[PDB]
Amino acid sequence: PIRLRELIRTIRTARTQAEEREMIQKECAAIRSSFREEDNTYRCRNVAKLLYMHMLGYPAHFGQLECLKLIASQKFTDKRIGYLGAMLLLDERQDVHLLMTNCIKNDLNHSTQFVQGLALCTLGCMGSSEMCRDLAGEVEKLLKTSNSYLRKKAALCAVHVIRKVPELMEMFLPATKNLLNEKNHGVLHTSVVLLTEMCERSPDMLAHFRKLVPQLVRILKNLIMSGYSPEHDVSGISDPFLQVRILRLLRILGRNDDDSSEAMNDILAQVATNTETSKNVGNAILYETVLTIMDIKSESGLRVLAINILGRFLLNNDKNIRYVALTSLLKTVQTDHNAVQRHRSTIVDCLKDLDVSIKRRAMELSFALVNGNNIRGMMKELLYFLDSCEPEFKADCASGIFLAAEKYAPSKRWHIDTIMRVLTTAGSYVRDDAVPNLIQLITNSVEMHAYTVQRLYKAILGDYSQQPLVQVAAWCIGEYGDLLVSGQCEEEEPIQVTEDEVLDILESVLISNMSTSVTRGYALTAIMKLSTRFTCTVNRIKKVVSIYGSSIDVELQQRAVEYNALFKKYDHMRSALLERMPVME
Amino acid sequence: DRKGGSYSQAAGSDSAQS
Amino acid sequence: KGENTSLLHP
Amino acid sequence: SASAVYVLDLKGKVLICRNYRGDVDMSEVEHFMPILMEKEEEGMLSPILAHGGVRFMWIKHNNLYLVATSKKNACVSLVFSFLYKVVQVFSEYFKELEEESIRDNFVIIYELLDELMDFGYPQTTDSKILQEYITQEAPRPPATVTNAVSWRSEGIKYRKNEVFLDVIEAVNLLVSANGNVLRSEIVGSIKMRVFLSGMPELRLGLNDKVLFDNTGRGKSKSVELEDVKFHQCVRLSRFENDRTISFIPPDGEFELMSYRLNTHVKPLIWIESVIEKHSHSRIEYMVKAKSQFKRRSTANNVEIHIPVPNDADSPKFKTTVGSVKWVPENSEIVWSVKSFPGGKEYLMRAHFGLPSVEAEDKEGKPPISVKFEIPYFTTSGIQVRYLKIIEKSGYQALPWVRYITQNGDYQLRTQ
Amino acid sequence: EIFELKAELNSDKKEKKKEAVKKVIASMTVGKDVSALFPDVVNCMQTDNLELKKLVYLYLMNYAKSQPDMAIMAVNTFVKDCEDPNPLIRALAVRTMGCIRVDKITEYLCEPLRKCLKDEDPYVRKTAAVCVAKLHDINAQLVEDQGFLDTLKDLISDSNPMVVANAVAALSEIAESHPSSNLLDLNPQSINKLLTALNECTEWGQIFILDCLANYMPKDDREAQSICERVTPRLSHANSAVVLSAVKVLMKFMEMLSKDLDYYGTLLKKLAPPLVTLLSAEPELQYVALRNINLIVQKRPEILKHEMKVFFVKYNDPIYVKLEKLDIMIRLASQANIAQVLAELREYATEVDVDFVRKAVRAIGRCAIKVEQSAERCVSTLLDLIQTKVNYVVQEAIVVIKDIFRKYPNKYESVIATLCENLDSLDEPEARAAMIWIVGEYAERIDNADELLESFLEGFHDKSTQVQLQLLTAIVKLFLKKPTETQELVQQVLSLATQDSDNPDLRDRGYIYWRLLSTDPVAAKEVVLAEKPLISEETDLIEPTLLDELICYIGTLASVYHKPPSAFVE
Amino acid sequence: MIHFILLFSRQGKLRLQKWYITLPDKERKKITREIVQIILSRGHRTSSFVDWKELKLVYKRYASLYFCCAIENQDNELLTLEIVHRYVELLDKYFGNVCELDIIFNFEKAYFILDEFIIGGEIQETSKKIAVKAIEDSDMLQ
């Protein structure tokens, strides 16, 4: 039985990855040999070594039955080792935790407060969809006890069961009633967390849980008044976790009612100005209070105080404070949107910050703050940010710009120009999913087609490696070939479009190696549709279709064969099915 | 002695080929 | 080394 | 066309660097480690890396990777040959290739790196010749480098003239799981330790099939070597003209010639192994080894590696001759036999447990490899005919040679 | 520290100076920015002991570009050292002069380079040849003004074969960067002279000697025959690069040789054993050998036609070698060794490398497509692999079957029943789409084609664009072939892809299918369900123009990457 | 609730791990590797907050070994930092001058303390002395 410290030293003595793997295998061989003999004296050391090997990156599948056997053992060290193994290497998808239900039930009624607590913690950490079904009866029994050290564990187990089984919340309603008078801070915090979870799960208990709002307000006021305490007082803040839980419960309660908001209005006002934000706990409490006020129907003064606090925190040099302020502003975007416009300069400056999280928060705030009047002004800033954005932020910036243009675009021409600029500058950053949205937007607009067609033709001849831009240009050509070239049936004056450059471009795109089989299909469809849309270049695409009918791609080959068959046997019926597709929202 | 086969003396040339 | 140092140094 | 030859470590730290052209910035080595990590984690890791317009072609040594940066279209083969020569020189000078000598032998290492290659073009690679101009404990360079003979220093004098040869055989057999042998190649290795006085011109003569046919004796046992690779001392023109192997042996042990021809004979050892592996219950290893080699030959240190289950524990071995041990580090049954007389038959019956819980992922079937090494046995039948040791001064040489037969790529595919 | 080191280096005691030099070298190697002390070490440079002079020269070379201004205090020392009686000191000084990347220092080094160009010591001659090339690379105009081209040309026609090889390499490097104007090419006499010193060149000198012939283009068979006869002994060199260089030279010379003569046959016969020997090199060189074989395989595939057993990948072979082994086997795959290739592929499919398994599946598919005589064996192997119940193996087998059906579907109706129930729950887009295409095109041997497509129509609007298009095509084909059991299925597909489908290409395809169905369903049989022509397989052989150019670039980066030298250099 | 907590060293070695979400072993390893790469590829002025996979990944290492957490987008950000600081202080008080060496050798004690402090991703005891007393009583049981 090698000791855990000796095994750790041996592992640390390994330098090469191969040497470490060899040592781990050598230890695991002895561990498996000991396990196969049904060892019970030094089983704790073997379990610890197996857990260390699994954490170090070694398989531990064979060490599954040993943990179950040690769980139902009688030694305290063996029971603790088994519980740790079940918590670490055991999960719902393991399929070996089904037999652990009997062990948990046996240990759930144990007189010892440590074995029962360990079993409850293991059940909460590795709760399964079926384990909670057969353990719900025992969980409720422990929740009604008067054990302070076990009340928190019972509350955590009930919360875990409710999260895993939302339909089991009905059995916890009569157990949590009249439990807000616990003197212990941990019990009160667990009760508050359970009440918040029950309220967030279903709204039926909101009315029942909304009557205790005065009790929660009184508890919060007492906690605020009792600012000195040996336990739970960190950095001058007493019960920061309890205060955060109370603020979250207040924010989640009365968000659509006036009585609940009015009852907690005094507490929010007192905490909004009687809290010290010098430490991180105070800043977190202030942020939670601001979020709760924004998420509830509070008074105008509370909203003004929250706006002032957010403005003050936005100027803080701390990265965490700036991120919290940005998150609060993003959350309070729809609510108090007029008051959020005062931080436009701060939002713009945050985009140039050297923080990835800060930059992302600033970009999100700018995207969410785009209105129907600042869209034109913010378009230049968005384009500048996209041009000088990070490689991982270019696609997100382009998607946000496209969404803003499609939502509150000042005009179709301006929106079309912005979309074309984004496509030309996005390059390989625009997602292929936005291509169908752009196609639908182009099809919906039936007033600006000549300028859009000319712009697409100009931007498609220069480059063709942009898959989304190439697909958009091909779709535009297929939809408006009759408008891109006007009166191009025969030779005419030298213009931008001559009825032959489009066919050459389509052929190059189809035969170009920079094709993912999606742009090639769009080009083939555009060429097929150009037979009826364009009549100047006739009898020329048929040869290409016949030649393209032997392509390696099965779908491409079938499309080429169908096009050749339509051109060679349904020449009169080719135009009978080339009508424009319907346009829908 | 030596593992892998005892060393043997080598000739000077193909005496049978002149 | 850098590992024997305290996590918070209190 | 390497730009800078550098030596890295297992932690990404460059133990030593030696720029040859200076066309590549020294900061590109930092991106080599992340690039190698990305390639290894994605299966695209290769010895020839590429940091944009600069290629990092290098091999992995015992403890560090000798990465040589390059930017132009340099010869990758030339870079690999230079790296191999540098590794050989380091092994000859330093008995160990680890970080302990890199940080301790820098004084001579820097001088060797500077003298070996100039402007990316190596000039000297002989460790014995280089030891006379660069030492770690300087006179004019020896005339051997300037002269044509750069592998035999003149003026060497010894009390006796004894040359020890080693006809080492490499029995490589690739037997499929169906029982048929696919790749069965035997590569000869004529390694000689020449220790004489002066600069003798060795005239190697063997019973080659081509030589026998040319002389008219193509009817006796003649070695049919498909590929024959002579050393640098061996004159290519002399061998190409009339199969005349005339060359100046070096001072020390070196590989003169290395024959490589296919083998169409039955395997010297026939292994009949079975796998009675129960479904998560037990396993059986009915391994039987039959020696097809001559009874007069004994395979010293026979090690037939039998890959057992990775998660197998509490194994029991029921064999006949030889010690069988399971090594958890390698996860296989080591059929170790000290002396195996030719024609012997060893039968083994393995029995090991298996966990009830199945493994998360498959582990594969490693091939069974035998480590038979039977000395004084020439499977190819090639025998040394003569060795013309000629010296200007005139002395009576006492050449010696031994034939050693071992197992090379003698792996057996599992079922 | 720094002050103490400077004081030690500025002392008159050699015992302290050597220790200070060693400490400075270790600090620079340890990763310490010691360039600030360059002027301090400048004074302690002219030392009689060679141990400290080499360290000072190395520090100056490593601290030359960093402090070019402070390097102006070494020209006099270099000039003084360029005349030392010891050849080693002169060679070291010449090497240090060329290694200093100083624009204002190389100008004054022309005189020492000219003096050492005609040095009697072969080491001095090699050092001067290397320094001339270094100066030309640093400044081509300065080298041209110094008139070192004439001296370099005369170096090849002198004694000292190592020095001759070094001069040839320097001239090749200079011409490599040159614009091809005033090339250093030589007549057959120069080639014969180089061949005479080729047998006396060192291991490194052999490559330099053989690289010169890579540019010369023979014009007659007699000259080509002599060149082949002289390069034949190079195939018996222990150096891997020398053998590769000889093979490349022989391949280049074969472009002018006549296949009617017996020289071509002898060269082809004498090259296979060399390839077999090179294939047994180090694992690092295994990839290079495989790349060289692939480059030469597409040009002269009649040399290694019988080399198939050696192409089998070993158990301990590297991943970069294992992947290339499959490509080599596919390139050399033929009906003679079709059974061996199939057996090797079957063994390679039992491994755990997902990338290796995919490569093996692709190689098996390529071999089956290339040779139609083993189509049945390939189909049986694919069926066995599918029955192996491997998700990645199942996807690979589905892809291979879909590829084979499009090429040889005339006798592929016997496997549709087995593939009808083959665990169609796999969500791989490459396998689900292939299965849908096979079902649509092969909806004749399966009586439950309509039922199978029902499961794939649940999420057709959100599965994928290619998957949705394949499903729509299969539904259209089923309706055209059997419209009794798929009459409502076609209408449902049209409604889902035309009303609830926002894909532009997919919407257009659905509208076209609906128009064809509503215009002439009979004509849809001859329009949609038509006999497509023979599918043109993607040939893996490189273009002849690139192969000829790639032939000259052998053993370099352009051959390993299979790309032109100008498409990869920066 | 904290989805997972991982204590990783500066060199990339992980000294502690506790995930409250049932995920596959390969998926968990990939997520841990990605988190290590992101944290190891982040500067000292990144705000100690990362939005990875819609999870507020907060990084706050007080020594060579760093700390990580996975909090859903439904609670405050400073709460996670306060909880991490409180856990570090409790571990230091229980152990006494806790260093990196004691973490590897005393991983079982750290796991027991974490289990007794946070269960299911949520807190179990807001105080700092009651949890220490409970841990000491449990350890003294034998």
Swiss-Prot record, chain B:
Q: How is it modified after translation?
A: (Microbial infection) Polyubiquitinated in a post ER compartment by interaction with human herpesvirus 8 MIR1 protein. This targets the protein for rapid degradation via the ubiquitin system.
Region of interest (Disordered), residue spans: 2-18
Positions where Phosphoserine occurs in the chain: 6, 12-13, 15
Q: What is the effect of changing residue 1 to V?
A: Allele A*80:01
Q: Where in the cell is it found?
A: Cell membrane; Endoplasmic reticulum membrane
Phosphotyrosine PTM positions: 7
Q: Name what induces it.
A: Up-regulated by IFNG, and pro-inflammatory cytokines IL1B and TNF.
Compositionally biased residues, Low complexity? 9-18
The coiled-coil segments of this chain are none
Tissue-level expression reads: Ubiquitous.
What pathology does the entry list?
Alleles A*02:01 and A*24:02 are associated with increased susceptibility to diabetes mellitus, insulin-dependent (IDDM). In a glucose-dependent way, allele A*02:01 may aberrantly present the signal peptide of preproinsulin (ALWGPDPAAA) on the surface of pancreatic beta cells to autoreactive CD8-positive T cells, potentially driving T-cell mediated cytotoxicity in pancreatic islets. Allele A*24:02 may present the signal peptide of preproinsulin (LWMRLLPLL) and contribute to acute pancreatic beta-cell destruction and early onset of IDDM. Allele A*03:01 is associated with increased susceptibility to multiple sclerosis (MS), an autoimmune disease of the central nervous system. May contribute to the initiation phase of the disease by presenting myelin PLP1 self-peptide (KLIETYFSK) to autoreactive CD8-positive T cells capable of initiating the first autoimmune attacks.
Q: Which residues of the full protein are shown?
A: 338 to 355 of 365
From Swiss-Prot, chain D:
Task: Tell me which domain of life the UniProt entry assigns to the organism this sequence originates from.
Answer: Eukaryota
* UniProt entry tagged with the keyword Disulfide bond: no
Give the N-acetylserine positions (modified residues): 1
Read off the Gene3D superfamilies from this record: 3.30.450.60, Mu homology domain, subdomain B
Q: How does it sit in the membrane?
A: Peripheral membrane protein
**GO BP term, pick one:** vesicle-mediated transport
Q: What Gene Ontology cellular-component terms does the record carry?
A: AP-1 adaptor complex; cytosol; early endosome; lysosomal membrane; synapse; trans-Golgi network; trans-Golgi network membrane
Modified sites of kind Phosphothreonine: 144, 146, 215
The MHD domain sits at 160-413
Q: Which CDD domains match?
A: AP-1_Mu1A_Cterm, AP1_Mu_N
Which cell locations does it reside in?
Golgi apparatus; Cytoplasmic vesicle, Clathrin-coated vesicle membrane
Question: Keywords for this entry?
Answer: Acetylation, Cytoplasmic vesicle, Golgi apparatus, Membrane, Phosphoprotein, Protein transport, Transport
Instruction: Give the family, as the similarity comment puts it.
Output: Belongs to the adaptor complexes medium subunit family.
Its protein name is: AP-1 complex subunit mu-1
**Organism in which the protein naturally occurs:** Mus musculus (Mouse)
**What broad taxonomic lineage does this protein's source fall under?**
Eukaryota, Metazoa, Chordata, Craniata, Vertebrata
Swiss-Prot record, chain E:
Membrane-topology annotation of the record: Peripheral membrane protein
**MF term (GO), any:** clathrin binding
Q: Which residues carry this modification: 3'-nitrotyrosine?
A: 561
> Where, subcellularly, is it found?
Golgi apparatus; Cytoplasmic vesicle, Clathrin-coated vesicle membrane
Q: Which UniProt keywords apply?
A: Acetylation, Cytoplasmic vesicle, Deafness, Disease variant, Golgi apparatus, Ichthyosis, Membrane, Nitration, Protein transport, Transport
GO terms under biological process: basolateral protein secretion; determination of left/right symmetry; heart development; intracellular protein transport; kidney development; melanosome assembly; platelet dense granule organization; vesicle-mediated transport
Q: Which GO terms describe its cellular component?
A: AP-1 adaptor complex; cytoplasmic vesicle membrane; cytosol; early endosome; Golgi apparatus; Golgi membrane; intracellular membrane-bounded organelle; lysosomal membrane
Q: Give the N6-acetyllysine positions (modified residues).
A: 305
Taxonomic superkingdom: Eukaryota
Tissue distribution:
Widely expressed.
Q: What does the UniProt function comment say about this protein?
A: Subunit of clathrin-associated adaptor protein complex 1 that plays a role in protein sorting in the late-Golgi/trans-Golgi network (TGN) and/or endosomes. The AP complexes mediate both the recruitment of clathrin to membranes and the recognition of sorting signals within the cytosolic tails of transmembrane cargo molecules.
Similarity comment: family membership: Belongs to the adaptor complexes large subunit family.
Indicate what this protein is called per its UniProt record.
AP-1 complex subunit beta-1
Within the intact protein, the region shown is 14 to 583 of 949
From Swiss-Prot, chain F:
Q: InterPro entries from the xrefs?
A: AP1_sigma, AP_complex_ssu, AP_mu_sigma_su, Clathrin_sm-chain_CS, Longin-like_dom_sf
Q: List the disulfide bonds.
A: none
Transmembrane segments annotated in the record for this chain: none
Keywords from UniProt, A to Z, are:
Coated pit, Cytoplasmic vesicle, Disease variant, Golgi apparatus, Membrane, Protein transport, Transport
Q: Where in the cell is it found?
A: Golgi apparatus; Cytoplasmic vesicle membrane; Membrane, Clathrin-coated pit
- Please give the tissue specificity annotation from the record for this chain: Widely expressed.
One family from Pfam that matches here is Clat_adaptor_s
Subunit-structure text: Adaptor protein complex 1 (AP-1) is a heterotetramer composed of two large adaptins (gamma-type subunit AP1G1 and beta-type subunit AP1B1), a medium adaptin (mu-type subunit AP1M1 or AP1M2) and a small adaptin (sigma-type subunit AP1S1 or AP1S2 or AP1S3).
Q: What is this protein called?
A: AP-1 complex subunit sigma-3
Organism annotation? Homo sapiens (Human)
User: Mind giving the lineage of the organism this protein is from?
Assistant: Eukaryota, Metazoa, Chordata, Craniata, Vertebrata
> Its gene?
AP1S3
